[PDB]
Write an enzyme that holds these catalytic residues in place. Structure first.
Site, PDB file in Angstrom:
ATOM      1  N   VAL A   1     -17.010   1.926  -7.794  1.00  0.00           N
ATOM      2  CA  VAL A   1     -17.851   1.249  -6.871  1.00  0.00           C
ATOM      3  C   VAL A   1     -17.724   1.167  -5.561  1.00  0.00           C
ATOM      4  O   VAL A   1     -16.994   1.153  -5.202  1.00  0.00           O
ATOM      5  CB  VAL A   1     -16.497  -0.176  -7.183  1.00  0.00           C
ATOM      6  CG1 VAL A   1     -17.431  -0.778  -7.454  1.00  0.00           C
ATOM      7  CG2 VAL A   1     -16.506  -0.930  -8.750  1.00  0.00           C
TER       8      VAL A   1
ATOM      9  N   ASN B   1      -9.461  -6.825  -3.109  1.00  0.00           N
ATOM     10  CA  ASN B   1      -9.374  -6.392  -5.098  1.00  0.00           C
ATOM     11  C   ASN B   1     -10.654  -6.254  -5.722  1.00  0.00           C
ATOM     12  O   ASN B   1     -10.480  -6.668  -6.710  1.00  0.00           O
ATOM     13  CB  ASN B   1      -8.275  -6.851  -5.395  1.00  0.00           C
ATOM     14  CG  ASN B   1      -6.410  -6.246  -5.248  1.00  0.00           C
ATOM     15  OD1 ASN B   1      -7.184  -5.121  -4.439  1.00  0.00           O
ATOM     16  ND2 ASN B   1      -5.472  -6.757  -5.874  1.00  0.00           N
TER      17      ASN B   1
ATOM     18  N   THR C   1       0.216 -10.414  -3.128  1.00  0.00           N
ATOM     19  CA  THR C   1       0.321 -10.748  -0.736  1.00  0.00           C
ATOM     20  C   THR C   1       0.676 -11.783  -1.211  1.00  0.00           C
ATOM     21  O   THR C   1      -0.271 -13.076  -1.321  1.00  0.00           O
ATOM     22  CB  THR C   1      -0.840 -10.270  -0.955  1.00  0.00           C
ATOM     23  OG1 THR C   1      -1.446  -8.743  -1.268  1.00  0.00           O
ATOM     24  CG2 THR C   1      -1.222  -9.632   0.593  1.00  0.00           C
TER      25      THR C   1
ATOM     26  N   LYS D   1      -7.721 -11.355  -4.391  1.00  0.00           N
ATOM     27  CA  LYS D   1      -7.854 -11.139  -3.042  1.00  0.00           C
ATOM     28  C   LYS D   1      -8.549 -10.404  -2.974  1.00  0.00           C
ATOM     29  O   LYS D   1      -9.265  -9.567  -3.639  1.00  0.00           O
ATOM     30  CB  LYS D   1      -6.524 -11.174  -2.682  1.00  0.00           C
ATOM     31  CG  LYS D   1      -5.886  -9.326  -2.872  1.00  0.00           C
ATOM     32  CD  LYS D   1      -4.602  -8.844  -1.610  1.00  0.00           C
ATOM     33  CE  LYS D   1      -4.808  -7.659  -2.460  1.00  0.00           C
ATOM     34  NZ  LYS D   1      -3.068  -6.791  -1.192  1.00  0.00           N
TER      35      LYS D   1
ATOM     36  N   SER E   1      -6.152   3.725   0.042  1.00  0.00           N
ATOM     37  CA  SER E   1      -5.193   4.414   0.326  1.00  0.00           C
ATOM     38  C   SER E   1      -3.625   3.293   0.278  1.00  0.00           C
ATOM     39  O   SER E   1      -4.556   1.939   0.758  1.00  0.00           O
ATOM     40  CB  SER E   1      -4.845   4.977   1.429  1.00  0.00           C
ATOM     41  OG  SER E   1      -3.478   5.597   2.003  1.00  0.00           O
TER      42      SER E   1
ATOM     43  N   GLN F   1       1.248   1.096  -1.080  1.00  0.00           N
ATOM     44  CA  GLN F   1       1.583   2.379  -1.080  1.00  0.00           C
ATOM     45  C   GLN F   1       2.191   3.402  -1.824  1.00  0.00           C
ATOM     46  O   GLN F   1       3.039   4.048  -1.351  1.00  0.00           O
ATOM     47  CB  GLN F   1       2.881   0.944  -0.907  1.00  0.00           C
ATOM     48  CG  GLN F   1       3.695   0.814  -0.829  1.00  0.00           C
ATOM     49  CD  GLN F   1       5.335   0.106  -1.070  1.00  0.00           C
ATOM     50  OE1 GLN F   1       5.616   0.602  -0.235  1.00  0.00           O
ATOM     51  NE2 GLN F   1       5.066  -1.083  -1.904  1.00  0.00           N
TER      52      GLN F   1
ATOM     53  N   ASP G   1      -8.188  -3.269  -9.902  1.00  0.00           N
ATOM     54  CA  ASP G   1      -6.553  -3.188  -8.949  1.00  0.00           C
ATOM     55  C   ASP G   1      -5.634  -4.033  -9.608  1.00  0.00           C
ATOM     56  O   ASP G   1      -5.357  -4.652 -10.055  1.00  0.00           O
ATOM     57  CB  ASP G   1      -6.423  -3.176  -7.506  1.00  0.00           C
ATOM     58  CG  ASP G   1      -4.728  -2.949  -7.252  1.00  0.00           C
ATOM     59  OD1 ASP G   1      -3.889  -2.699  -7.811  1.00  0.00           O
ATOM     60  OD2 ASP G   1      -4.487  -3.211  -6.017  1.00  0.00           O
TER      61      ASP G   1
ATOM     62  N   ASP H   1      -2.440 -10.631  -8.969  1.00  0.00           N
ATOM     63  CA  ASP H   1      -3.261  -9.905  -7.371  1.00  0.00           C
ATOM     64  C   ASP H   1      -4.371  -9.651  -7.433  1.00  0.00           C
ATOM     65  O   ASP H   1      -5.688  -9.080  -6.509  1.00  0.00           O
ATOM     66  CB  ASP H   1      -2.673  -8.505  -7.420  1.00  0.00           C
ATOM     67  CG  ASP H   1      -2.713  -7.868  -6.593  1.00  0.00           C
ATOM     68  OD1 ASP H   1      -2.302  -8.536  -5.505  1.00  0.00           O
ATOM     69  OD2 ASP H   1      -2.425  -6.199  -5.826  1.00  0.00           O
TER      70      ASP H   1
HETATM   71  C1  LIG Z   1      -5.750  -2.674  -1.520  1.00  0.00           C
HETATM   72  N1  LIG Z   1      -7.068  -2.045  -2.656  1.00  0.00           N
HETATM   73  C2  LIG Z   1      -5.480  -1.019  -2.525  1.00  0.00           C
HETATM   74  C3  LIG Z   1      -6.484   0.581  -2.580  1.00  0.00           C
HETATM   75  N2  LIG Z   1      -8.025   0.552  -2.992  1.00  0.00           N
HETATM   76  C4  LIG Z   1      -7.875   0.560  -4.392  1.00  0.00           C
HETATM   77  C5  LIG Z   1      -9.490   1.566  -4.509  1.00  0.00           C
HETATM   78  C6  LIG Z   1      -9.935   1.626  -6.421  1.00  0.00           C
HETATM   79  C7  LIG Z   1     -11.353   1.884  -6.452  1.00  0.00           C
HETATM   80  C8  LIG Z   1     -12.196   1.798  -7.661  1.00  0.00           C
HETATM   81  C9  LIG Z   1     -13.501   2.173  -8.064  1.00  0.00           C
HETATM   82  N3  LIG Z   1     -14.364   2.441  -7.052  1.00  0.00           N
HETATM   83  C10 LIG Z   1     -13.975   2.955  -5.204  1.00  0.00           C
HETATM   84  C11 LIG Z   1     -12.275   2.257  -4.996  1.00  0.00           C
HETATM   85  C12 LIG Z   1      -9.107   1.634  -6.784  1.00  0.00           C
HETATM   86  N4  LIG Z   1      -8.184   0.750  -6.350  1.00  0.00           N
HETATM   87  N5  LIG Z   1      -7.432   1.354  -5.283  1.00  0.00           N
HETATM   88  C13 LIG Z   1      -8.451  -0.539  -1.582  1.00  0.00           C
HETATM   89  C14 LIG Z   1      -7.575  -1.734  -1.991  1.00  0.00           C
END
Ligand SMILES: CN1CCN(c2cc(-c3ccncc3)cnn2)CC1
Length: 280
Positions: free
Chosen positions: A95, A143, A179, A140, A20, A22, A160, A138
């Site tokens: 993942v 990610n 960030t 970190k 989740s 922004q 991400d 990005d």
């Molecule tokens: C800072 N980020 C933003 C939100 N999140 C995600 C998770 C995934 C993802 C992809 C594949 N398998 C599981 C999860 C993809 N995009 N964003 C994690 C924390």
């Protein structure tokens, strides 16, 4: 570029939430035709040209174009893209072992070998991206996700790509800011950016992997950013007393203000330790 405009619910069933943010939510999903499982990232579109809510179409299209190019064990793969009036829906590789962030929180401090196990995979994924002239912008621990968190040497993938850009002229000069804890000085100073910014972020990640502490973190975002710009970090003996001098040498060659003097990805892989948003 237009995407598939059929209802995603006609082709996929969704389940538990995986993330989740922004302007996005990520749901586990299952393709009806194959039974295979994915992560569906729902990105909120902009409702007007002048609006600050949602993601611009230019930014969505950039991310999709980059994701479409990439296939590497340490990066995420894009399966399909859908859209409707409200959202663009990226069907991404699942993942399922959680963020490296949450792994590091839950586990006692890492050994140098456990840190380099992770770091070598990150370096391999970044080497691929940089070979492609893709800056991620990005990087970190949040990610980077693990395929399985219950093995001794977890495998990782970079996720991400919402800030990623192709660097075809050696630098880009756009609205790019990640960030505060992880951004390079050139980001903080709104200077032209290239692949070097990622290498700084890798130095910050490496510091955190070895110590459990963030090298530039202040009590406010502005303080963090000021610390980054001044290269105000040090290796605290409480955390680094049994860390090798070579590990520190690696980090010192990445946490360099002048991007031209910073180690490149190729340099990082040959280094003797390895060689075998912004407003409150
Ligand atoms: C800072 N980020 C933003 C939100 N999140 C995600 C998770 C995934 C993802 C992809 C594949 N398998 C599981 C999860 C993809 N995009 N964003 C994690 C924390």
């Amino acid at each position: 570029t237009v995407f598939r405009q059929e209802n995603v619910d006609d082709y996929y069933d969704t389940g538990e939430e995986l993330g989740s943010g922004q302007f996005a939510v990520v749901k586990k999903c299952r393709e009806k035709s194959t039974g295979l499982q994915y992560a569906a990232k729902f990105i909120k579109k902009r409702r007007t040209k002048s609006s600050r809510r949602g993601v611009s179409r230019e930014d969505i299209e950039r991310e999709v174009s980059i994701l479409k190019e990439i296939q590497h064990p340490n990066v995420i793969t894009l399966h399909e893209v859908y859209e409707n009036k409200t959202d663009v829906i990226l069907i991404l590789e699942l993942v399922a072992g959680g963020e490296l962030f949450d792994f590091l929180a839950e586990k006692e401090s890492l050994t140098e070998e456990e840190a380099t196990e992770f770091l070598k995979q990150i370096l391999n994924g970044v080497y691929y991206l940089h070979s492609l002239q893709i800056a991620h912008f990005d990087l970190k621990p949040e990610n980077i996700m693990l395929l399985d968190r219950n093995v001794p040497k977890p495998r990782i993938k970079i996720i991400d790509f919402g800030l990623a850009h192709k660097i075809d002229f050696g630098n880009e000069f756009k609205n790019i800011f990640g960030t505060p804890e992880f951004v390079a000085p050139e980001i903080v100073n709104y200077e032209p950016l290239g692949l070097e910014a990622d290498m700084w972020s890798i130095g910050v990640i490496t510091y955190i992997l070895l110590s459990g502490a963030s090298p530039f973190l202040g009590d406010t975002k502005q303080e963090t950013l000021a610390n980054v710009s001044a290269v105000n970090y040090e290796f605290e003996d409480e955390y680094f007393s049994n860390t090798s001098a070579l590990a520190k040498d690696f980090i010192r060659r990445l946490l360099v203000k002048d991007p031209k003097k910073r180690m490149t990805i190729q340099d990082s892989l040959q280094h003797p330790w390895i060689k075998p948003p912004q407003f409150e």
